[PDB]
């Protein structure tokens, strides 16, 4: 009931020989797992918390210049001196000025000049780096019980939250009435945080690559520093003006926090006002269904009447949902539910919420099913008063194929090699595809590091044109060109 209502919801079918399934979890996305004879579960990654962040680098972003001082020297006696440049908290620059008798010295020519002033930082930026050991992933576990306050009730304590850390690969969750689930994930290889640093604004935050953060042209202290005055490369935020070779003046460059905001175009925003909360990234996992049970397999069949309290709704994936209340006697009991044809000859659809039960007579239940394309009929209850609900599904099987392969291509593109683990069951073809994806993606990332989508499209067009003007090399070139054009058009950055 957690996934029902989200567009970014995917279906995984079947289990391996070892009753395990490899899945990947995403923020804002979710996957539902069902098998031939197993309960159907809801999986959603909702929280990623990191402990003890370490300040990698503190960037100054607001500065002011005060206590400005300067003095000149007559030409050909070296450079002017203050007793003052000995201190690094000040910023100093040597420019070149004109001198003369009216300027206070007895020699004519170009003279030296130097200016220094306070460099006090008003507001600053801090970059926090966290080891993968300190990461924590929070996952909600929601069996398809179908209780009336469960569909999309993310704020309700209906599903079970599980906490997984790299310290324990095995995390084990007991479900009341559904057995106990074995959960395996790979937090360490989801995102290699050794190359990302948490950038924090006054009230906003972003997850950025470490290298680009190290290449920011702003004043900095090391994170371990506490003095708060040794600002390195201060010349990037000051300007020394020498209008007409008579006087050098220093002024402070403005506030780049809007400029920094612009510089974060391709970054992903997070927050750490009350803890390093991140809602970004993916987590590869292996789901073991060894000890999952079906709830209420000792409850008899419902014999009374049923009434519909909430009508059928059509999801984004061709599935349907309905809320029905049991009006008869014998609770608890199983809800009759078939997806039959017009002659009631051949079963057409399949239940998403397998063999549901009525926990309480007054409490309605939510049922999910996947009707086939075209006319479909939902049979709830039995005679007397057997409900038969007609439904129609738009589209076609060929369509279903085209959008499912589009979604597969998109998820493959946005995950990389790890997308082959979305529904992998250990097949040799899956391993071969994974290896090919790792090598191809490594080459692709090496060749397209730090390039925009527009210029990616340009390069792709060039490659296709080259391929069209050359046989095996030609087809390889046009293939790589079209796939990189798709990658460029699909990527948001």
């Amino acid at each position, epitope marked *: 009931m957690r996934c029902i209502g989200i567009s970014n919801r995917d279906f995984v079918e079947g289990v391996s020989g070892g009753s395990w399934v490899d899945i990947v979890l995403e923020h804002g996305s979710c996957v539902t797992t069902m098998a031939k004879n197993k309960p159907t579960l809801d999986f959603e990654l909702i929280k990623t918390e990191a*402990k*003890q962040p*370490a*300040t990698l680098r503190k960037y100054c972003i607001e500065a002011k210049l005060t206590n400005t001082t300067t003095d000149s020297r007559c030409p050909t006696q070296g450079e002017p001196s203050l007793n003052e440049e000995q201190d690094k908290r000040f910023v100093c620059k040597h420019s070149m000025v004109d001198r003369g008798w009216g300027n206070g010295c007895g020699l004519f020519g170009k003279g030296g000049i130097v200016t220094c002033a306070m460099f006090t930082c008003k507001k600053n930026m801090k970059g926090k780096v966290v080891q993968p050991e300190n990461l924590e992933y929070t996952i909600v576990i929601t069996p398809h019980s179908g209780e009336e306050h469960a569909v999309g009730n993310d704020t309700g304590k209906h599903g079970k939250e599980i906490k997984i850390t790299p310290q324990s690969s095995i995390t084990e969750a007991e479900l009341t009435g559904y057995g106990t689930v074995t959960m395996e994930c790979s937090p360490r290889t989801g995102l290699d945080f050794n190359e990302m640093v948490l950038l924090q604004m006054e009230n906003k935050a972003w997850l950025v690559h470490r290298q680009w953060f190290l290449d920011l042209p702003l004043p900095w202290l090391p*994170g*371990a520093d*506490t003095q708060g005055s040794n600002w390195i490369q201060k010349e990037t935020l000051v300007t020394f003006k020498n209008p007409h070779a008579k006087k050098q003046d220093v002024v402070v460059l403005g506030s780049q926090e809007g400029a920094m905001h612009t510089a974060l175009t391709g970054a992903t925003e997070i927050q750490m006002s009350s803890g390093n909360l991140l809602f970004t990234g993916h987590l590869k996992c292996r789901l073991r269904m060894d000890k999952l049970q079906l709830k209420g397999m000792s409850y008899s069949m419902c014999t009374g009447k049923f009434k519909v309290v909430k009508e059928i709704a059509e999801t984004q994936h061709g599935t349907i949902v309905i809320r029905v209340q049991y009006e008869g006697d014998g609770s608890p009991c199983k809800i009759p539910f078939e997806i039959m044809d017009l002659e009631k000859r051949h079963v057409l659809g399949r239940l998403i919420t397998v063999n549901p039960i009525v926990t309480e007579k007054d409490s309605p239940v939510n049922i999910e099913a996947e009707p086939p394309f075209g006319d479909s009929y939902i049979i709830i209850g039995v005679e007397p008063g057997q409900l038969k609900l007609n439904w129609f599904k738009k589209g076609s099987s060929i369509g279903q194929m085209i959008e499912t392969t589009m979604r597969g291509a998109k998820r493959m593109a946005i995950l990389g090699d790890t997308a082959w683990d979305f529904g992998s069951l250990g097949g040799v073809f899956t391993s071969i595809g994974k290896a090919l994806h790792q090598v191809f993606g490594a080459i692709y990332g090496a060749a397209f590091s730090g390039v925009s989508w527009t210029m990616k499209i340009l390069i792709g067009v060039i490659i296709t044109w080259i391929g069209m003007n050359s046989t095996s090399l030609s087809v390889s070139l046009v293939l790589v060109g079209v796939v990189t054009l798709y990658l460029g058009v699909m990527v948001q950055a």
Partner: antibody
Amino acid sequence: EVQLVESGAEVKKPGASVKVSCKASGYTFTSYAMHWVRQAPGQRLEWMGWINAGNGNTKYSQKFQDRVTITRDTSASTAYMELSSLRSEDTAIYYCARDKVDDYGDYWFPTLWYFDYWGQGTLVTVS
Amino acid sequence: ALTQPASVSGSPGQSITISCTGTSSDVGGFNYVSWFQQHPGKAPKLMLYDVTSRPSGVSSRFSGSKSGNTASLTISGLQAEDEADYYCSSHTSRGTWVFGGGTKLTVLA
């Protein structure tokens, strides 16, 4: 057995000079650094500095830079801590502690089990 | 300096946790976190160094752990002889040593 022996209690007027002796026995003195820690009665511990017996180099705390000088004696396997210009607030218990230097005869990175043994302490009262 | 509660009291045979807090240069960056027991009128003795590990001859009741910039000491099964002064010491980044303010442990009768 590593035994740390310290001198007896001493009383001196303010502004005088006091040198305390901490003698360590039962081990190779030259291959271990020597520490000096003070503590006001009923107060927290304060760390002055250390002397490396391998080379005799000195390092003191920032507060005690210009007033605390500590020397070592290889023959007697003892280290002498001398404090000059005593003040009424200097009245405290003084402990001498030991820890291992690296295999190169230097004390750059202290060992994990630093302050492995402690001396009985010397009580100094300032009038 | 190092910040820690002045006094901590607990019933005998119970489990209590005491924490020593410093800064990023000494506590939050290094594993040089050690705890010393100071008997009244007696020389200090180390009960714990390298909080992930324990010294020799010290009972396993004492356990130490570090959470970010705060280092914690946990004692299981409080007993009468545990009433003594406990100090947290850290070797700072600048090469010197910093000590806590001293903690008095009280066991209820």
